[PDB]
Design a binder for these strands. Structure first.
Lengths: 98, 83, 119, 108, 88, 94, 88, 96, 78, 104, 91
DNA sequence: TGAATTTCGCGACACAAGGCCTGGATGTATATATCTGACACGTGCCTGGAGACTAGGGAGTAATCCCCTTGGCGGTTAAAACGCGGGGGACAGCGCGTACGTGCGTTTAAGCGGTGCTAGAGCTGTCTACGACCAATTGAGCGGCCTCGGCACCGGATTCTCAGGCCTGGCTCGCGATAGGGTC
DNA sequence: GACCCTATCGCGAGCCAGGCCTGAGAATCCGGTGCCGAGGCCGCTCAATTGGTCGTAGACAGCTCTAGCACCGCTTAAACGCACGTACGCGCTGTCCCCCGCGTTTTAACCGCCAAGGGGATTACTCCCTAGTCTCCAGGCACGTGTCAGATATATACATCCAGGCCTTGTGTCGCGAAATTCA
C-alpha cells in the first residue's frame, strides 16, 4: 500500500537533478577547516582569501567528478554496477597519478 | 585553536552527491575512506605548490591566483578565478 | 501417423513430443508452478535396444508453461538452456516400432512417460 | 595630424591590435615582434571567441533562456568535437557536467 | 479399424473414468454393469486381470453379466488389452 | 587605484555582432577573459619556441600561422588560417 | 514406516513382477498365492481392484488365501494402494 | 614429440623479450608505412634514417605502455586474455 | 603498407609489455591505433619541416613533435 | 680561476649563464642563479649516475648502457615520479609480472 | 656542436672511479641535462614574471627546484645549491 | 431376413472467459504575479595607443660544395604465413547471503545576520648595491688520430627446469550372511 | 522360545590421485677469438674572464584602509542512526571455440656495393622593418543609476495507471442420422 519505488529510481532522479544543477556539493565550513588544517602542516599561521578557498573547492569537486566518471567506466568494464575501491585504484593507476 | 581531524568534515552524503553527479548509480560502503584519502593527497599536492608560491612572494595570505597557478602547473587549468 | 501415442504423467512435467526418428525429445511443465528437475534422468527404450540414460545437471528447473527440448547429437541443433538441450554424447534417441520414453526423478521414480507404438 | 583609425579598424577586427602588440612586447616571448603578427593573432582570437559565443548562444536559445551563463558555455564547449579537443584540460567553474547516462545503466 | 472412443480411452489412463467410457459399453450396458457392482472402469479391469487377459473368458463373462454381443465384447476386450499393453 | 586590464568590451562587441539580442553574465565574462588569456599564452609560447628553434629573433606572421596550425585541430586550423590571411591582406593593402 | 521392498515396488510399475515382489510377502506366502492361482503381482492387484480397494476386505482375503498376518497384510495393502494412487 | 603446455612458452618469451632491448618491428615495413603516411600531407619529403628510427622507437614505447595498461584492464575484469574493449577503455581513461 | 606491421610484430610487442594471451581482433585495432598515432606525430613533424622551408624531415623535427605531445624522447638530440 | 672551481662544482657555470642569457628567459639574470642551477644539475646527475652504477654491478657488467639507466630510473620512486612521461631509447622495461599471471 | 660530455665524464669518474659510459648513454645524459635545464629555467621565468620582477635570482631558482623536484631530491638539491652559493660568495 | 440394439458423429442452444471502450485518481509540465540585485547604459578622465622619422642590424636573396638520400641489383637466409591438434580460457546461468538503498525520527552544527579590529596587502618615496656592456686576454674545451681491450660471438660443459610413465593407495559398488522384529 | 522375513556389515573388484624417476630442452657458466669504439693525446681557437663604468630594480620605511579572523545568536537543512527489504556480486559449473605450439613452404629484409644530384650548410651583399624617441589625443576604465530576467512560488491543463462495463469467441451438450451386428 505505501508508495515505495524500486531501488534505483530515486538514484536516477538524483543523477538527473545533480547533472542538471551546478551548485557546490560540499558544505563550505568543513572543507575550509580541512584546508586550514592541511595548510598548517607546511607553514603555521597562514591566511586564506575566501575566493582562494572557493577555487580550491571547485577544483577538488571537478577532480572528484572526473575520477568518479572514470571509476564508473571501470566498474562497467567488469560488468558490475557498484563501484569498489579497486576500481578507483585502477583508474588512478591508469591515469598515472600513482 | 589548533585544527585536527577535519577530514571527517567531508561527510558521507557529500561524497554520495559527488558520485551521483558523475553518473555513479550504486556506491559501496568502503568507498568513503578511499575518497577521503584521495582528496587528502590531492589537497596536499595542490596546497604545497600554493604555499610555495605564497612564500616566494613574502606574503602570509594565499591569494586565489596562487591556487590558480598551482592548478595550472598540474595540467588542470581553472577558468573563472583568473581576474 | 501409423504410430499410436500413449502418455501418462503424475507430476508437473509431461512428455509432450517425441521425435519418431529420434532427433529430439520434448517435455513441458504443464502446471502453473516452476518445476525443478535437478539430477533427473530419462531412460529411452527402443524395442529390444539397450537402454539410453540421459542425466540432467544437479540443479535445473523448468519454469511453468515452458518447454525444454533434449536434442540428439545428429539433429545439429544448438544447445540453449533452459529451452534447448543437445545430447552431444548420443547421436540419436533411436528408432523402432516400439519407442518408450520415461521421465525419472532424482529419487529413481518414473513420473512421466510417452510411448510410440507402430502396427 | 591625419585622422587616426585603430589597426583593428584597418583590419576590420573587433579585438584590439595595439593591446595584443603591447602584450607581445612585454611578454618576453622574443626580442622582436613583427608588424602583422598582432593582426594575425587578433584575427585568430576573434574567430575563436565568435565560435564559442555562437555555440553558447545557440545552447541558451535551446533551453528557453536569453542570457549566457557558465552552464551554457560548458554545454556549448563539451558538445563540439574540436573545441572539446582544444580545451580538454580546462575546468569551467560552476559549469556542471554533460547530461549523459551509460547505456547499460538503463533498464533492459 | 479402431473406434474413436476406444482411441480416447487408450490414449490416457482410465483413472476414475466410469464404466461407460469403455469402448463398446454404453448407457444401458454401463448401467447394467454398475447395478451388478462393477461401477467403474478399473473395477472391470480388475476382473479382466483376474481372467488373465483371456479373450474368451472375459467376453463370455461380459455377455453373461450385461448381455453384450460379439462386437461390443470384442471392442471392450481390445480396449482393455491395449490399455494393459500401453500402461500396465 | 591601479588600472586592471581585461577583454570585457571586446567580447561584448563580438557577442553583439554574432547575436544582436543576447546578454552575457559577469561570470561568463570572466570565463571568457580567462579563455582569451590562456589561448594567447599558448599561441605566444608556441611561437616563441618555434622562433628559437630556427635561430631566429623575430616573431613574424609565419611563426604565428605555424603555431595556429600546430595548436588548433582540424577545421579550426583552416578557418583561423583563412581569417588571419584575410586580416593581414587587408592591413597591408591600406 | 515403509520397507525397502515397499519403496522398490512403488517406485516402478509392476509389469511382470512375481507375487513374491510384493512388500511383506515372503517366499512361503508367494508360493501359496501362486498355488491358489494368483501367480503374479498384477493378478493380486486385480483382486485389490475387485474388492474396491477396501483395506479390511483385502487383508482378510489375503489372510484366508495365503495365511498372512496383520503386519504382512498391512504392508501388502499399503504397497498396492500406493501403486494404484501413483500409476492408476 | 616433446610439447609444452600453452602459456609456458609465452612466459619464456616474456622473460626473453623483457631482458632484451632491440626493436621488435622490422625496419623496412615501418619505413614504407611512414613514407606512405607523409604522402597525404606533402609530396616530395625526404627522411633521415635517424628520424625514422626515432619514430619507430616512439611507436614501440607507446604501444608497450598501451599494452601494459590493457593487460591491467583485462586482469581487473577477472580475465587473462586481452580484448579490443580493454584497449578502448584504456585509451578513453588515459584521455585519448 | 599498413599491412607491413605483421601479426608477429604486434605479438612480440604485446609479449614485451606483459600480455599473456592475445585475442584475434587485437591486431586490426592495434594497426588502427598505430596509424592514428603516426598521423598525429607526422602531421606536426611535416609542419615543422615546412616552417623552415626544408624538403627533408630531420630527427629534431620528430623529437620536437614528440615533445609537444607530452612524450619526451631522449638520445636522438640534437 | 674558473667559476666552477670557485663554487666547487664540475658543471660549467659560464655555459649555464650563457644559455640563460641566450634563451630569452628574462631581461636580466642574477649572479648566483647559474651557480645554484649548476649545483642542482650536478646533484641530479650524480644521483642518477650513482644509481646506474649500483645497477651495473648487479648484472656483472662494467659499462653503463641505456638499459642500466632505464633500470635505475624506473627502480627509484622519486626519479620515476620526476620522469614519468619520458621515453628512453634502447631502454627496455622493468621486469613486472602480475601475481594472477603466475600459475597456482 | 656543444654538449655536456666532459662534465658528465668527470662526475662519473668522481662517483665511480672505475666505470665507463658508452656514447649513446652520454647522449641520453646530454638530453636529460637539457630537459632539466629547460624545465627549471622556464619555471624560474614564470615565477619572476608572476611577481612583476625582471631578475632571476637564486631565490627563484630555489623556489623552482622546490616546485619541480619531489620530496627528498628537493631537500638535497636545496642543500647543495645553498652550500655552493655560500662557497662561491665566501671566496 | 427384418427388427431390435447399439455406437459414432453432426448441428442448434447455453455458457463462461477473454478482449476492447470509457472515466477517475494520480503526478507532471504550463502560465502568471512579484521583487530584487545584478546587468546594461551614460559620463569624466588620463594614460596607453597612434603618427612621423631615423638608424641599424636581421633577414632575404644569389652562388657553391659535398653528402647523404634516393634508386637499384644479387643472396642468404631469418622471419613470416598457413594448416592442424588441442586443451585451456571466456561466457552464460544459477543460487545466495550479505551488504547497501530507502524511509523516518533525531540532533547538531552549518548558514545567515551583524560587529570590531588589526595584521597585513597595497601604494608611495629614497637610494644604493648590483648587473648589463664593452676592450683585452688566453687557456679550457672542441676536432681529428690512434690504440687495445670490453664486449659480441661462438663452442663446450653443468645444472636446472618441465613433463610424462609406473606403482601404491584410497574410495566406491555390489552379493551374501548374522542379527533384529514380529508372529505364534 | 521357535520360526519367517528383512536389514547392515565384510570383502572382492575396478576407477581415480599423487609420488618417484628419467629424459628432452634450455638457461647458464667458462674459455678462446676478433673487432671497432671509448679513452687518451695533440693542435687549435674563440668564449669565459677581468676590470671598470653607469643606469637602475628593488629593498627598506612608512602610511593607509580592508577584509580575515574572531565572536555571538537564531533557524532549520541536513547529517545521523536505526531497521528492513531486496538485489547484486561472488563462486561454481558446464560448453565451446580458438589462439598456441609446432612444423613446412615462401619471400623479401638486410647487407654490401655502386652512382648521381637535391638540397642543406655555408658565405657575401644589400635593404628595409622595426626599436626607439617625441608629441598628440581619445578609448576604455572607474563610478553612478535605473529597470527587468530570472528566481520564487501558486494555480491549472495534460499524460498515465487502473478499474468498471460492454462485445466476441471458443466450448460442452443432447436429440437424432448413419451404419454394423445378433436373435426372433
Amino acid at each position: 500500500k505505501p508508495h515505495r519505488y524500486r531501488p534505483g529510481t530515486v538514484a536516477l532522479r538524483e543523477i538527473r537533478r545533480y547533472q542538471k544543477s551546478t551548485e557546490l556539493l560540499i558544505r563550505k565550513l568543513p572543507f575550509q577547516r580541512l584546508v586550514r588544517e592541511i595548510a598548517q602542516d607546511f607553514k603555521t599561521d597562514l591566511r586564506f582569501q575566501s575566493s582562494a578557498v572557493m577555487a580550491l573547492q571547485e577544483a577538488c569537486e571537478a577532480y572528484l567528478v572526473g575520477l568518479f566518471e572514470d571509476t564508473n567506466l571501470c566498474a562497467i568494464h567488469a560488468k558490475r554496477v557498484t563501484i569498489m575501491p579497486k576500481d578507483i585504484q585502477l583508474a588512478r593507476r591508469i591515469r598515472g597519478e600513482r | 585553536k589548533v585544527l585536527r581531524d577535519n577530514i571527517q568534515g567531508i561527510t558521507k552524503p557529500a561524497i554520495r552527491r559527488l558520485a551521483r553527479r558523475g553518473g555513479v548509480k550504486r556506491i559501496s560502503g568502503l568507498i568513503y575512506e578511499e575518497t577521503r584519502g584521495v582528496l587528502k593527497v590531492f589537497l596536499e599536492n595542490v596546497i604545497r605548490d600554493a604555499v610555495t608560491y605564497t612564500e616566494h612572494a613574502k606574503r602570509k595570505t594565499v591569494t586565489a591566483m596562487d591556487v590558480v597557478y598551482a592548478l595550472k602547473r598540474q595540467g588542470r587549468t581553472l577558468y573563472g578565478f583568473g581576474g | 501417423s501409423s504410430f499410436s501415442q500413449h502418455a501418462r504423467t503424475s507430476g508437473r512435467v509431461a512428455v509432450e513430443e517425441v521425435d519418431e526418428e529420434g532427433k529430439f525429445v520434448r517435455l513441458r511443465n504443464k502446471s502453473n508452478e516452476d518445476q525443478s528437475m535437478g539430477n533427473w534422468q530419462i531412460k529411452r527404450q527402443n524395442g529390444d535396444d539397450p537402454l539410453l540414460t540421459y542425466r540432467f545437471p544437479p540443479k535445473f528447473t523448468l519454469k511453468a508453461g515452458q518447454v525444454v527440448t533434449i536434442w540428439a547429437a545428429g539433429a545439429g541443433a544448438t544447445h540453449s538452456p533452459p529451452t534447448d538441450l543437445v545430447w552431444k554424447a548420443q547421436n540419436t534417441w533411436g528408432c523402432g516400432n516400439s519407442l518408450r520414453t520415461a521421465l525419472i526423478n532424482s529419487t529413481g521414480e518414473e513420473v512421466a512417460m510417452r510411448k510410440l507404438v507402430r502396427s | 595630424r591625419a585622422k587616426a583609425k585603430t589597426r583593428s579598424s584597418r583590419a576590420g577586427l573587433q579585438f584590439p591590435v595595439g593591446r595584443v602588440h603591447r602584450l607581445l612586447r612585454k611578454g618576453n616571448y622574443s626580442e622582436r615582434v613583427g608588424a602583422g603578427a598582432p593582426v594575425y593573432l587578433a584575427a585568430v582570437l576573434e574567430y575563436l571567441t565568435a565560435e564559442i559565443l555562437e555555440l553558447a548562444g545557440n545552447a541558451a536559445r535551446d533551453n528557453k533562456k536569453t542570457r549566457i551563463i557558465p552552464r551554457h558555455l560548458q554545454l556549448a564547449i563539451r558538445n563540439d568535437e574540436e573545441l572539446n579537443k582544444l580545451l580538454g584540460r580546462v575546468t569551467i567553474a560552476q559549469g556542471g557536467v554533460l547530461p549523459n547516462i551509460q547505456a547499460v545503466l538503463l533498464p533492459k | 479399424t479402431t473406434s474413436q472412443k476406444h482411441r480416447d480411452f487408450v490414449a490416457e489412463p482410465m483413472g476414475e473414468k466410469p464404466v461407460g467410457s469403455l469402448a463398446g459399453i454404453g448407457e444401458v450396458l454401463g448401467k447394467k454393469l454398475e447395478e451388478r457392482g462393477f461401477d467403474k472402469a478399473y473395477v472391470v479391469l480388475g476382473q479382466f486381470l483376474v481372467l488373465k487377459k483371456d479373450e474368451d473368458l472375459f467376453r463370455e463373462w461380459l455377455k453373461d453379466t450385461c448381455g453384450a454381443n460379439a462386437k461390443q465384447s470384442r471392442d471392450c476386450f481390445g480396449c482393455l488389452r491395449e490399455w494393459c499393453d500401453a500402461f500396465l | 587605484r591601479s588600472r586592471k586590464e581585461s577583454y570585457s568590451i571586446y567580447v561584448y562587441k563580438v557577442l553583439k555582432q554574432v547575436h544582436p539580442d543576447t546578454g552575457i553574465s559577469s561570470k561568463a565574462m570572466g570565463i571568457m577573459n580567462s579563455f582569451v588569456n590562456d589561448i594567447f599564452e599558448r599561441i605566444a609560447g608556441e611561437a616563441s619556441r618555434l622562433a628559437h628553434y630556427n635561430k631566429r629573433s623575430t616573431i613574424t606572421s609565419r611563426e604565428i600561422q605555424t603555431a595556429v596550425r600546430l595548436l588548433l585541430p582540424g577545421e579550426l586550423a583552416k578557418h583561423a588560417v583563412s581569417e588571419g590571411t584575410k586580416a593581414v591582406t587587408k592591413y597591408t593593402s591600406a
